[PDB]
Every structure is written in structure tokens, then in C-alpha cells.
Amino acid sequence: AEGFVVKDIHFEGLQRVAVGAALLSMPVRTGDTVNDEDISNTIRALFATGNFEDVRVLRDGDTLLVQVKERPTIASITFSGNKSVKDDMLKQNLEASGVRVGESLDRTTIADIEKGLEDFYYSVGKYSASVKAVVTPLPRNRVDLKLVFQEGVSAEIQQINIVGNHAFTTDELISHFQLRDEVPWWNVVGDRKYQKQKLAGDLETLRSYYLDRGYARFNIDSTQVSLTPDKKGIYVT
Amino acid sequence: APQVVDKVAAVVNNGVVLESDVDGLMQSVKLNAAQARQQLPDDATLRHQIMERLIMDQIILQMGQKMGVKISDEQLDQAIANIAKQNNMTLDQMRSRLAYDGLNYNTYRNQIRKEMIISEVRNNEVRRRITILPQEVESLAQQVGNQNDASTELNLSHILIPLPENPTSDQVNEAESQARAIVDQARNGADFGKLAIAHSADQQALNGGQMGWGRIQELPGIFAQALSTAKKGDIVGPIRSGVGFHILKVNDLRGESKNISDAAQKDRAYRMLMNRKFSEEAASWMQEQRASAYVKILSN
Amino acid sequence: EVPDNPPNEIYATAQQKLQDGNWRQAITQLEALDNRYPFGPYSQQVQLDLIYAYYKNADLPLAQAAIDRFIRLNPTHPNIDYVMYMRGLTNMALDDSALQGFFGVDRSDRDPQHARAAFSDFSKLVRGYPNSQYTTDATKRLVFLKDRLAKYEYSVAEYYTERGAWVAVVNRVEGMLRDYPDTQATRDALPLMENAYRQMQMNAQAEKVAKIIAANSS
Amino acid sequence: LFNSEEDVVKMSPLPTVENQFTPTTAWSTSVGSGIGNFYSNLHPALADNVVYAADRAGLVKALNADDGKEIWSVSLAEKDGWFSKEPALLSGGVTVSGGHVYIGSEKAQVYALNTSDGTVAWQTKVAGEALSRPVVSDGLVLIHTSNGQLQALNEADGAVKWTVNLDMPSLSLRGESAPTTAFGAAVVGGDNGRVSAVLMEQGQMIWQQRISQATGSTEIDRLSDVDTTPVVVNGVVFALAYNGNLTALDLRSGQIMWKRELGSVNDFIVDGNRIYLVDQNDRVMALTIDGGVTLWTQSDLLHRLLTSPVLYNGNLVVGDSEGYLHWINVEDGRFVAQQKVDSSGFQTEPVAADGKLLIQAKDGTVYSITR
């Protein structure tokens, strides 16, 4: 009724998913009494399976024709533009997010991966870096993923300031730090690059330095990491 | 030969918007505009606005599902009734719903459910982003508290029929006749706002002549004298003056027995301030969530 | 390096190379045919041929990966027993050395991890598909692997007998009896347990083990 | 390896202009090593025909405005040399109110020197490094520290009167907002992206509005520091955030009146019915006081790292990181003149007062730029 009697159900566009699985995913089993809401629920369920990018249902009067467009499978992964982050680390980062050769392309995760990589570039101090993904459609329902990296110039620590040190001096305290405010002209093996993990370890080293002298009450009230408006002058306090 | 029954119009994160839902909201807004088509005369812009409406609804629904908000059928019961003007709801509501869209009874409730879900999540998040300072509710109420010298405050509207600096007797007679006709029409149930828009020469004409809340003693002397015996809903005649004839209307009044020497007022200021902040935060949250989500229009 | 000829030509070339026995070029052709057409009429046959070529090409880790992929993607394929048998063969092959095999070295003392994995795989195949055509060879390999694992435990017990660690010897032989009761290594190890009991002056346990040995003198 | 191969995204070339007038430097005096390569707010100040300037090292000089002759000079470094004669790290822009010269320092110190001779009238320890220009009003000195504290110090005694705590995000832009005074209310920006108004009597918040948009998830797209000085006129407060909105708010209510999609950290000028603003991409603009409608836009100086503008002789003057001063016609936005003043560049604000135009270069050379 309404949707008429379903004599048979035909699927179109199925490439990877077996017809049995698609039938199992639909709520109607040639029930012979299908309404519009039943068709809408069927579409919603089919999309909820996560295997299709587009779903459409047509009626021949007797036949329910389910036209689906399967989400494309990954053909290859290409990294271009990266000058610092190697392709190996990137490729392992891809597999963690499910992007792997031979698997499907989860479009909704694209933004996620992009942001993640940008976050990584920000942890190293390479602000203004961008990582944008391009999906090109290859035949037989495939895609090629190219990650265009456009890294900027790494920001350099302009200053490392400690406020409230009356027993020791800033120079002495930061001499033991991993992060370097300045590098002597003779030393050409170190730089003033920033890293969040190094900053946390640095705070721990300062705490240990103050606790090994018998203070037993040293407390880091706060830590502020600032950045010049041109994004190449990171500051630490 | 094959007939398209339904299709995905837009993809929203893991959910979808179906062309059937788009048509349903199409019909909803068309029925809404049937009462006054000036509300939504646009067609393409209306269609895109409804597209965005469904997109936001899907975003909010998926977010609420993620959090875990749920509503029982018991909460549904009654949450519809005692709303239709004098309707015999939960029995007559269903019978009348059969004649408009109630082909299946559940449809209505399943929609109501959904709407409640979205409301509950929106309210929860938007109000979570709101912060209120007492100093702020105090300042908002301070003006009224200072102005509460009068035991009763009147909401008022005014209309002006102009006269020149040196009017003739004929001009005075014409202005008086027009003012008296306007007063009679208003007392006969005519809309005061429309009359003010059509005839009033005051700057508030395009605003319907609304003057707002006021202390009677602070009004012009003629207004204070005329309104000394006025009550809510009253229409007062014209008042002669060197610049024309004045007409006054009382819309509402308020007062309390508490001695104002402000007194139980900051609650109302809190309500209004919370409403304004809720509107702002909702707009900022409705666009913070549209930007952050994945959307693809396949309407093609 | 693989041309982009239509799918049929690529499959024919891969089959010809497999028949000729050139494993590397057949592997390259099959990889091209699989990564160009991921889900097609060739998918299952190409995956099986890749497993076979990887096995014959000594690319055992790749064979294991392909076997796992096939099993997880096609849990109910009619030719699934063949994949389990191939997994058993791969694990058994990881438990072999050619240089030591040339000199006639008994490798039962080396790492038994791969032997254990092969035993598990072959037992799975034999129990799941009793009527498969690979069941007899699987059973023979299971017998051999059980003997090898018991010989490993015997080697450990013998070393600890040499060291004078009697509790370790007793525990090892008890584990052999609980795990591999019917192997020859357990029969050989039984006198070691009796000696370990005797050294610790627990004569009742030694007498019990001696009775067990006598009842099974052969 | 790559740090040398790495290349920046953009930088505009030098606009080609013809000078409708000849700009000349009346005088130039060296105040020391200057701020250097440290992003600071330290800029000169003018008062009663005298010019006060300083540098990060600690030197403070009062000079004759007419010819730049030095009147007195002092150093705020350690008196007894307790440790290597440590630099004072002066960062708070030199302010001159009454007979006092207020300077902030990155050692959480605020100095008030004497105008007559330069002796330290008093010195106070604040909650954190004072990166903002001290604001003198109602006998109080307002300091916005790096850790989101707005403190008020007594003008004479120098003791802290009250303190307001402002939220601090995980990552922010160097620099802090200088409050503005209006009818006993101090309006100040915040590194979280909100403009807040507080009282002067005891520091009781009035209202706190959010100006930013922060349409992003990662840290960089969430940067919304309101590091500019809000401008109050006729009961409306104009504020502007980084990546945020140029908004107009009700002074009493803090309610948004109109909004625009421009962002910057430099100051803007509000005069007559127009708002001369420098975008965060170094693009000069002119808008309307009524709304965000644009009158003209000058996009020839993108990524030049311009300083905040100053309205001098009816022309908008802006410095440049290379050491160039550009004049602009307010009516049209066309370049009117261009001059090469210094070689170290400009980073701090120019000063325009009493018919005089002052600017301090990165090396510390104060310049009087006359026509």
C-alpha cells in the first residue's frame, strides 16, 4: 500500500558491499506494504551503515530500485611540499586515522586529519603552516589523496623569563634548560626552536632544581607562552 | 518509467537530510505564510534558508544523541495539550490532526519529540556559555527603581495632529475633526498603531506612536492632567495646544504594594538580561556549530 | 613498471609467470592487478595467488599479512580451509633454517614460538574442516610439531638436571606430562623426574615415578 | 638544513610614490641600544615641551623637544650591581602624567621617575611583567600584566589598590591592552577575546562582552587577543580583536551596536565620523562611525609590518619595519609622501602632539619628523 507492493528489490552501484549485507541493512523485507516514511527510514539506515556516500530509492510501481554511490576506495597516498616532516611519520599518522591504501575514504575525517597535522606543525613552532588535502577521483570508484604541505618559517624563542626568582638568577636557572633563549656564536649545533614537550620537561627541570636546594615549597604559579603578531617571535614566561 | 521516491539532499556529518523532510518543511512554511504571505514571499531564498534549517537541526540532533539526551513518551503526554485554544486535546487534537497531516498518528509525536530534543540541547549549551554579573542586573533595574516614585506606572502611546504657528480657524476645525474621528475609531476597536502610522505627525508615527513605560508626573503637564483618571485600555480625546492636537492611549499599567524607599524588581531585570544574553549566545553557538561541522549539499 | 593493459591481459600474464615459476614477476603483476582493481572479478583469485606466490617466494611475513587479510575479509569463503593450511605452512616455514639443516642440526632446542603458532593454525584447520583435502597432511604436521615441542621441554629439563635445579626439573617434567603425555620426549624425561625426586630425598614420589616408568617400560 | 630553505609566505614591495611635500627630520637623538628585536611597547612620550624615552637596557632620557638636546639621563639597572648589572627590561610604554614618568618592566616592576631630575619617586612590584602602557587616571595608575591581571597603583604612594583577574588562554599574542577611562570606568581588552569594564573606586566589574569570533579549533585559529586600546566617544566603545571583529558597544550596557569582520593588534584612530584602522595584514582602511561601511582601502603595504597610525596635520602617518614613513590622504587613501628615516626599522607607535611628530626606531634613535 502507499508505496505499492514491492515485488522485488534491485540494487545499483554496489561494488564492495555484498547484496546480502545491503538487504540486511534495510528495515523492509519486501513487506508488500511500504509507505514513504518506510522509504525514508530505509535511506537513513542505509546511510547509517557508513558504506555509502549517496543513496536514492526509486519506484517502478512493483520494483524498489535502490541506487547507491559507494564511498570511494583509496588508491594511493601522496605527500608533497613537506620539507621537515618526513613521509614515514606522516604515513604512520595516516594509518592511525584510518586512511590507508586499499581502504575506503572517510570524507568526514578529512578535516580531522588536516587539523591534526596542523596541530603537529604548531607544536614544533611552525605557525602559519597549512596542510590541505586534495581528493581526485580515479576511475572504477577510486580516489587519490594528496596532502599539500605549505610550511612557513619556524618561530624562534625570543626570551625565556622567570618572574619571582630572588635566590637564584634567571641566567643560572635557564642554563640547564633544553630550550635556548640565545646561542653563542661558537655553538652552531643548537637553535632557538620551540617544542611543547621540551617546555614541559623544562618546567620539570626547574621544579627539580628548586626542590633539590631544600625549598620544599617551590610552586610554579603559571606559565605563559606568547607569540609575536608576525608569528616568528614566540615568548616564554 | 522509474519514479524517484526519495533521495539525500544534503549530508551532515554522519546524518543526512532527505528531500522528503525538505518538502515537509516547504509545506510547513507555505502554510505559515498562507496566513500572511508577506512573511515569506521569497522562494529560492526560502528554499536555501530551509536547507540551512534542516542542516542545523541535524547537527544539533547528532550532538544531542552523542551526549545522550532522551525523552520519554510520558514527557510527551500533555506537552501538546492545553495549548490549542480551548481544544479537547489528546482526543480532539488527534481527530483534527487526521484532516491536515495525521495520516499516521505517530508522525506528529515523533516530530514533537525531535523538536524537544533539539531545544533541550540548545538551551543546555547556550545557557552554559552565559555568565551574569549582579552588578549588571542591578544597573538595569536601578533606572526603574529610581523612576518608581509613582505608585502606578503607565504604558502609553501618543498621536499628534499638527498645526502651524499661526493656524486659521478652518485649519483648527479640520484638525479637531480629524482628532475626534481618530479618537472615535480607536474607541470603536480600531488599531491604535495603524491610526498613529496613518495620521500621527509625531516622530513615533512609524513606530506606532508607542511611548513606552513612564511615570505620570514626568509627562507633559497636559498629559499628566488628562491621564490623572485614566486606566488600562483607555482612549482619551484630543488636547488643544499651540502646535496641534494630542491624543493619548494607555496600553498597560504596573505596580505593587511594597514601599519603594528597587523593591522586588531585579528579578524582572534578570529575566530580560538573561533573554538577551541567551539570544546572543544562541546566535554565536548556531554559527560556531555550522562552521565546525561537515556539510555537503547534493541537492543538485 | 607494470603496463596498464586491460585487466584480462594483466591476469593472463600473471598466470603465465606463475606457471613458469618466476615468482617475483608474477608477484609484481598480481600486486599491480590488486592495487589497480581492488574489488573486481579477480579479487579473490588474485589474493589467493598472491598468498601462494609469497609462500613460494619466501616472503613469509607478506604471506601472513595476506592470509590475515583474506581470512578477515572473507570469513566464509568456500576455499578458506586452504588459507588456514597455508598459514600453518608459513608458520612451520618460519621454524626452519637451511644452513643448520645442511649440517644435520636438531633444531628442537631453538625458539618454539613459530612451532606453537603452526600447531595452533593446523589444529584450527583440522577441527574446523575435518573433510578438507589438507586434513591428513595437517594431522601429520601436528604430530611432528607436538613431538618437537615436547623435545624442547625435554631439552630444558635435561639442562636443569645438569645444573642441579631439581625443582625446575620436576616442574618441567610435570608440565610435559600434562601437555604432551603421549610423546616420546615425555617417556625419555620420566627418568629425569625420578632422579630429581631422588636427589631431594622425596622417596615416595621417586617410587611413584619408577612405577610409572616400569608400567610403560617400552 | 631546511630552516634556511624555509621561506615566508608574503611581503609587499615598496610602493612607488611622488612626494607632494618634503618631509625632513628636525633632529635625531640616540637613547641607547633600543628595544632591539624584542616585541615591546616602549615608545617616547611628550609633555610640556620635553621628550621622554628609554630602552630595554634601562636608560631613560629626557630631551628638549625643540632640538633634542639632552636635559637629564639616568639608568634603572641594579644600583649596587647585585647581579651583572642586570637590564631593567623596560617594556611598558613611557607615560608622563603630572610630574611623574611611569615605566613598566618585564621584571614585574613599575617605576615612577621624577620629571624635574629623573630620580625614582617610587617603585612597585606587580603580579607579573608589565607589558602594557601605564594609564594614569583619577589618581591611579593602571597596569595590565602578562598573566591577565589589571592592577591599580596609587599615583603618589605607589601601593597597589585593587586587582582584577582576567582569564589567560594557553597561547596568546605578545603584548597587553591599555585600559581607557570614561566617567570612572576603565574599559580594557583581554587576551581571551573579551572587552570588560571595571570601576576605579574598587575595581568592581560592570560588564564583560565577547568581541572575538574564534571560528576554529586549533590554537592558531583560536587566537583572539584584544591587545588594542578601546576608544570611548559619545557613550560608545570601539574595540577590535585579532582575527576578531571591529565592534561598537554601549558604554553603559556593553551591548553590541554593530559588528565588522576586521582584525588587528595595532591601535586605531576615531575622529569625526571615521575610523582609521590598520588591519592585521598591514592594510590601512577608513570606515564610518555609524557602521562598518568602508570609505577607502590602501592595500599597497601588505605584510610590511606597519606600526599603528597617527593623524598628523590631517594626514595619516604610518611607520614600516624597513624604516620608511608613509603619508596617506585621509579623504582618498592615496599615498601623499614617502621617506626613508632609519635603517633599523620601526615597531612601536609614533607620537603626535602639540604640532610635533615623534617616532623611536628599533635601535633607540628618537626622531622628530617635521614637514
Side-chain angles (χ1 to χ4, degrees):
Chain A
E2 286 183 60
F4 232 74
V5 181
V6 174
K7 282 179 183 169
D8 64 350
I9 303 167
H10 311 170
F11 271 96
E12 277 82 345
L14 277 285
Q15 168 163 358
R16 151 197 328 123
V17 201
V19 176
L23 267 156
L24 274 159
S25 309
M26 301 210 317
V28 311
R29 49 186 305 282
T30 39
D32 194 338
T33 320
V34 184
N35 58 49
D36 304 333
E37 203 155 5
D38 298 322
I39 293 173
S40 300
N41 178 4
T42 302
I43 295 173
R44 223 163 287 255
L46 280 168
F47 213 103
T49 67
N51 300 308
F52 308 113
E53 206 193 1
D54 184 16
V55 179
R56 177 177 307 82
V57 180
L58 307 95
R59 181 181 125 178
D60 195 32
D62 296 0
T63 303
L64 227 49
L65 188 78
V66 188
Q67 273 182 359
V68 319
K69 303 178 181 169
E70 281 190 7
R71 81 170 47 279
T73 183
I74 306 269
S76 65
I77 317 195
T78 303
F79 313 123
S80 52
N82 46 327
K83 302 171 168 177
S84 72
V85 195
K86 307 305 318 198
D87 300 16
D88 165 357
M89 300 132 56
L90 295 172
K91 190 215 63 48
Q92 269 72 17
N93 181 305
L94 277 302
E95 54 75 17
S97 314
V99 184
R100 165 161 20 71
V101 155
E103 293 337 305
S104 284
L105 180 82
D106 202 355
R107 209 88 71 149
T108 197
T109 65
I110 282 307
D112 169 3
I113 163 166
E114 282 182 30
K115 290 287 158 192
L117 293 171
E118 254 157 32
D119 270 348
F120 187 7
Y121 273 121
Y122 299 161
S123 145
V124 154
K126 213 158 292 210
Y127 311 119
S128 86
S130 62
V131 178
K132 174 188 325 315
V134 184
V135 155
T136 59
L138 299 185
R140 305 173 231 106
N141 189 240
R142 300 178 299 130
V143 287
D144 227 320
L145 200 61
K146 207 205 310 286
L147 292 171
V148 190
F149 291 69
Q150 176 134 1
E151 315 173 350
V153 317
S154 191
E156 275 184 332
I157 298 172
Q158 287 290 325
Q159 190 181 253
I160 302 184
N161 205 25
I162 288 115
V163 179
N165 50 5
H166 306 132
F168 303 120
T169 62
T170 309
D171 267 320
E172 164 164 3
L173 298 167
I174 71 175
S175 95
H176 315 278
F177 283 10
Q178 275 172 305
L179 300 174
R180 319 291 333 169
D181 177 11
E182 57 213 302
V183 196
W185 89 100
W186 75 257
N187 191 58
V188 183
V189 54
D191 39 46
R192 319 191 296 169
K193 311 258 155 284
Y194 169 74
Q195 221 197 297
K196 298 262 282 293
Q197 295 80 40
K198 261 154 59 147
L199 172 54
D202 199 68
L203 292 183
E204 216 58 33
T205 51
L206 179 73
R207 182 134 36 204
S208 290
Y209 187 109
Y210 261 93
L211 286 166
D212 301 4
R213 264 78 171 172
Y215 284 98
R217 286 279 199 213
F218 172 87
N219 184 53
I220 286 163
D221 301 322
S222 46
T223 301
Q224 293 89 217
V225 175
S226 300
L227 186 79
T228 48
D230 47 75
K231 296 184 295 310
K232 44 175 52 50
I234 167 175
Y235 273 85
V236 190
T237 310
Chain B
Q3 283 192 246
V4 181
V5 187
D6 197 8
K7 62 180 185 174
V8 182
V11 182
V12 198
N13 273 118
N14 303 6
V16 287
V17 179
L18 303 176
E19 203 69 71
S20 68
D21 270 318
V22 178
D23 187 47
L25 219 60
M26 216 42 33
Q27 311 231 309
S28 178
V29 293
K30 289 296 185 211
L31 269 76
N32 276 242
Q35 251 69 78
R37 291 229 69 73
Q38 298 86 6
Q39 277 175 348
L40 300 164
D42 56 303
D43 192 304
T45 321
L46 166 145
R47 198 269 180 186
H48 186 279
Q49 177 185 355
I50 277 191
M51 197 40 31
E52 246 305 330
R53 287 273 335 288
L54 283 306
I55 287 157
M56 206 53 52
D57 294 22
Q58 274 300 304
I59 296 188
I60 299 155
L61 280 166
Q62 284 140 53
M63 194 177 18
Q65 172 172 109
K66 187 68 140 299
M67 284 199 261
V69 307
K70 294 179 291 302
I71 282 153
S72 297
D73 309 59
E74 73 200 63
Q75 330 189 348
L76 275 89
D77 302 310
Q78 220 59 13
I80 54 184
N82 77 255
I83 321 299
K85 186 191 192 306
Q86 311 308 313
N87 183 275
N88 205 331
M89 273 258 156
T90 316
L91 59 168
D92 165 283
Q93 145 177 56
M94 241 192 308
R95 296 186 199 87
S96 183
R97 169 55 77 173
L98 292 169
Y100 294 86
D101 216 39
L103 195 58
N104 157 282
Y105 147 68
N106 298 122
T107 59
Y108 179 84
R109 271 201 335 133
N110 193 4
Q111 186 195 247
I112 265 49
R113 164 57 183 285
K114 219 174 283 303
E115 150 161 54
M116 306 332 133
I117 324 188
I118 88 169
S119 304
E120 191 209 325
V121 54
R122 262 161 50 61
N123 292 355
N124 189 274
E125 295 262 289
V126 167
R127 265 166 175 252
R128 175 221 313 252
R129 299 144 72 72
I130 293 171
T131 75
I132 216 78
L133 311 173
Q135 298 102 300
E136 199 153 2
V137 60
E138 271 189 304
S139 304
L140 182 59
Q142 264 169 65
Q143 167 174 60
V144 187
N146 192 5
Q147 206 196 119
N148 294 354
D149 323 325
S151 61
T152 305
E153 300 153 50
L154 302 179
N155 192 293
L156 303 168
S157 297
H158 155 255
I159 288 172
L160 172 64
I161 307 304
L163 285 171
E165 186 167 39
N166 289 296
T168 68
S169 303
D170 297 346
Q171 286 166 344
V172 173
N173 290 350
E174 180 173 43
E176 184 170 1
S177 179
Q178 181 169 18
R180 287 180 182 274
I182 289 161
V183 164
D184 288 349
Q185 285 170 12
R187 285 175 176 167
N188 289 344
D191 175 31
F192 197 88
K194 186 174 180 177
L195 291 164
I197 291 161
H199 306 285
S200 192
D202 188 86
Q203 296 188 353
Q204 298 296 349
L206 296 175
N207 299 329
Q210 297 189 13
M211 159 282 201
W213 286 107
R215 170 177 168 219
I216 186 163
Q217 293 85 357
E218 291 186 5
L219 308 176
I222 49 158
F223 294 4
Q225 181 172 13
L227 295 171
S228 59
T229 62
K231 291 182 179 179
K232 179 171 178 168
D234 290 345
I235 302 299
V236 174
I239 309 166
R240 188 178 175 279
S241 73
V243 299
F245 286 88
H246 306 253
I247 300 161
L248 304 170
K249 169 177 169 73
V250 184
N251 310 321
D252 202 6
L253 57 88
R254 67 187 183 196
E256 294 189 38
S257 308
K258 297 176 179 64
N259 293 320
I260 309 180
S261 189
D262 189 350
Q265 177 72 332
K266 62 195 74 183
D267 266 6
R268 165 149 200 295
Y270 198 135
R271 320 315 313 118
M272 55 182 56
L273 187 63
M274 164 63 63
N275 288 348
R276 178 168 66 76
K277 295 253 214 321
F278 189 87
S279 180
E280 292 173 22
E281 276 291 347
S284 178
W285 191 62
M286 282 292 100
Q287 218 52 240
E288 164 172 299
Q289 295 299 299
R290 179 67 190 74
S292 196
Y294 170 32
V295 176
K296 182 192 313 314
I297 282 63
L298 353 164
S299 297
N300 302 300
Chain C
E1 42 178 300
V2 178
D4 167 29
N5 304 17
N8 236 357
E9 287 66 85
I10 280 283
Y11 182 66
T13 324
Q15 264 279 353
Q16 179 231 299
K17 296 313 196 343
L18 266 183
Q19 269 143 72
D20 169 64
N22 189 217
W23 307 124
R24 207 201 334 309
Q25 290 181 5
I27 283 186
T28 52
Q29 298 276 291
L30 297 160
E31 268 146 338
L33 184 70
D34 193 40
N35 77 38
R36 283 175 206 299
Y37 308 71
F39 317 107
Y42 299 161
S43 35
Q44 317 291 33
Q45 186 71 99
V46 164
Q47 276 156 93
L48 293 172
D49 289 32
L50 269 169
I51 283 161
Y52 163 71
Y54 284 136
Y55 171 69
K56 298 251 73 181
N57 198 46
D59 282 320
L60 305 176
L62 282 166
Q64 308 219 280
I67 285 152
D68 294 331
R69 172 169 262 252
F70 189 102
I71 289 173
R72 141 166 71 73
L73 267 48
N74 314 257
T76 186
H77 197 256
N79 299 131
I80 193 68
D81 62 66
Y82 164 82
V83 182
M84 311 192 75
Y85 181 72
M86 291 286 340
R87 184 175 186 58
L89 288 187
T90 300
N91 283 272
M92 216 166 156
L94 292 156
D95 193 72
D96 230 14
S97 194
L99 184 41
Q100 284 179 356
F102 180 88
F103 288 99
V105 171
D106 188 35
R107 286 183 39 81
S108 51
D109 324 316
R110 279 72 174 174
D111 202 1
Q113 162 185 352
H114 307 290
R116 238 172 270 284
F119 192 101
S120 153
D121 302 345
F122 282 128
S123 49
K124 260 199 272 282
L125 152 70
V126 166
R127 295 193 216 266
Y129 308 86
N131 281 293
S132 147
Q133 60 174 270
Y134 315 100
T135 284
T136 307
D137 198 3
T139 298
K140 303 278 278 175
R141 289 163 178 281
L142 282 176
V143 169
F144 167 86
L145 293 153
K146 202 177 174 177
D147 271 289
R148 176 236 187 294
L149 290 175
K151 275 204 280 279
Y152 178 86
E153 295 283 306
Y154 177 83
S155 304
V156 178
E158 186 198 33
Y159 161 76
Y160 274 124
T161 301
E162 221 192 352
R163 170 80 283 175
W166 306 126
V167 177
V169 170
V170 164
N171 286 349
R172 283 275 172 176
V173 180
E174 194 223 10
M176 285 170 84
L177 283 158
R178 289 193 285 89
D179 279 322
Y180 328 96
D182 47 3
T183 55
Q184 179 67 44
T186 305
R187 269 181 182 73
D188 294 352
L190 276 177
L192 300 186
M193 189 190 222
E194 196 209 330
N195 186 40
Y197 276 135
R198 298 259 187 216
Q199 295 292 322
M200 287 182 294
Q201 296 213 349
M202 299 201 282
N203 282 333
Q205 291 300 98
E207 233 62 61
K208 292 165 122 179
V209 176
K211 271 179 57 143
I212 287 170
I213 291 159
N216 295 267
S217 66
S218 307
Chain D
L1 265 181
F2 312 99
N3 56 300
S4 55
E5 313 317 300
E6 293 154 6
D7 283 322
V8 71
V9 296
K10 206 56 60 177
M11 169 83 199
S12 164
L14 183 63
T16 179
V17 56
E18 67 65 25
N19 314 0
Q20 310 186 359
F21 49 74
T22 307
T24 70
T25 87
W27 51 266
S28 83
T29 300
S30 186
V31 188
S33 179
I35 57 167
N37 271 118
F38 293 98
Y39 195 79
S40 305
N41 182 272
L42 205 53
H43 60 81
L46 186 88
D48 291 331
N49 228 317
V50 190
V51 180
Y52 305 85
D55 71 5
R56 274 190 120 242
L59 272 80
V60 187
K61 295 191 177 193
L63 323 165
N64 185 260
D66 289 315
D67 44 13
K69 280 321 304 168
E70 187 172 296
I71 289 168
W72 58 256
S73 162
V74 311
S75 180
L76 300 172
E78 298 301 341
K79 302 290 103 176
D80 60 345
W82 177 75
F83 171 71
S84 202
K85 289 281 179 174
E86 185 174 30
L89 301 190
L90 307 187
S91 199
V94 173
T95 296
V96 185
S97 211
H100 278 37
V101 177
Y102 308 100
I103 308 168
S105 152
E106 293 197 32
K107 305 263 62 167
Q109 309 289 313
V110 177
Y111 313 79
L113 285 56
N114 272 289
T115 279
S116 53
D117 46 74
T119 56
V120 191
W122 56 258
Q123 174 176 353
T124 296
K125 162 70 171 60
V126 287
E129 48 194 7
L131 305 184
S132 94
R133 173 178 57 83
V135 181
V136 185
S137 36
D138 298 358
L140 272 57
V141 180
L142 275 54
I143 306 295
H144 193 150
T145 78
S146 153
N147 50 347
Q149 321 277 309
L150 177 75
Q151 308 200 250
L153 287 50
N154 292 109
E155 248 202 277
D157 171 46
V160 181
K161 187 164 175 73
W162 50 261
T163 295
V164 170
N165 187 91
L166 310 172
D167 304 63
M168 185 76 15
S170 203
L171 184 80
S172 34
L173 293 180
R174 187 69 174 178
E176 301 290 328
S177 183
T180 308
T181 298
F183 321 119
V187 193
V188 68
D191 308 342
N192 59 74
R194 295 163 171 67
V195 176
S196 336
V198 317
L199 273 307
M200 302 273 197
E201 178 270 349
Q202 184 49 235
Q204 310 173 300
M205 195 81 74
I206 308 187
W207 56 259
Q208 168 151 315
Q209 184 55 239
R210 201 186 81 126
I211 267 58
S212 79
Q213 69 199 12
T215 311
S217 177
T218 179
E219 260 164 350
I220 287 288
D221 304 283
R222 293 211 321 289
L223 250 54
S224 50
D225 316 78
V226 187
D227 283 355
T228 78
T229 300
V231 179
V232 192
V233 49
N234 274 297
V236 50
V237 167
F238 298 94
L240 164 84
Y242 183 76
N243 282 331
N245 300 307
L246 167 65
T247 66
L249 305 100
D250 199 34
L251 181 58
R252 317 176 39 56
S253 321
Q255 176 171 357
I256 304 282
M257 290 192 2
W258 59 259
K259 161 162 43 165
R260 190 66 210 279
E261 265 288 23
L262 309 166
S264 92
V265 288
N266 314 117
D267 304 343
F268 52 96
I269 304 139
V270 183
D271 53 82
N273 38 351
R274 289 142 79 113
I275 299 173
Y276 308 124
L277 166 151
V278 180
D279 189 322
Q280 80 198 65
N281 300 299
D282 316 299
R283 155 168 30 214
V284 195
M285 318 175 63
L287 319 174
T288 52
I289 198 166
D290 55 41
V293 164
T294 307
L295 302 203
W296 59 258
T297 297
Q298 179 78 255
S299 178
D300 279 318
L301 295 159
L302 266 75
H303 298 80
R304 301 277 285 169
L305 307 193
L306 301 169
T307 80
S308 38
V310 285
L311 195 155
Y312 184 26
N313 270 123
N315 296 4
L316 181 143
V317 188
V318 168
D320 165 40
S321 149
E322 304 266 274
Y324 295 89
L325 300 185
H326 326 269
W327 281 250
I328 288 164
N329 200 27
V330 279
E331 202 63 32
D332 162 43
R334 162 192 62 288
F335 285 126
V336 185
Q338 175 175 118
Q339 167 182 19
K340 170 60 164 287
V341 156
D342 201 273
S343 303
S344 207
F346 308 133
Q347 186 253 289
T348 66
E349 337 173 348
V351 180
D354 308 345
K356 213 166 295 309
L357 170 68
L358 277 56
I359 184 154
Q360 164 156 317
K362 275 192 195 169
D363 75 344
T365 307
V366 180
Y367 282 98
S368 184
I369 309 290
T370 175
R371 179 217 292 298

